Design a binder for this molecule. Structure first.
Ligand SMILES: *[C@@H]1O[C@H](CO)[C@@H](O)[C@H](O)[C@H]1NC(C)=O
Lengths: 42, 48
């Protein structure tokens, strides 16, 4: 569904904790409910 | 994010006021306009 890629090259990679930072919720964020990346799991 | 979400209309109004305020910044008291006029005056003074 949603993948992580680099800012200077297109390479879709799985979303991990190394790639992502926790941020406060914004209303323009995508509420995803079917497939959830592992850093957003419990 | 909460401050920007709660104060969006105030931000837009202040930005519009600041962008409409630069219409009258073309007087002699402004430093940048004085520099523009100084450049034009130097260009004229060389020919003079
Ligand atoms: C995600 O949920 C928030 C919370 O209600 C909502 O404001 C926002 O519009 C939603 N975004 C999408 C893309 O569904």
């Amino acid at each position: 569904e949603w993948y992580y890629t680099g800012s200077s090259y297109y390479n879709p990679e799985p979303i991990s904790m190394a790639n992502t930072r926790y941020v406060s919720q914004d209303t323009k964020f995508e509420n995803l409910t079917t497939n959830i990346p592992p850093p957003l799991l419990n | 994010q909460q401050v920007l979400s709660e104060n969006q209309k105030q931000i837009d109004k202040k930005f519009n006021q600041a962008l409409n305020a630069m219409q009258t910044g073309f007087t002699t008291t402004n430093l940048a306009f004085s520099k523009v006029q100084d450049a034009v005056n130097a260009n004229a003074q060389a020919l003079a």
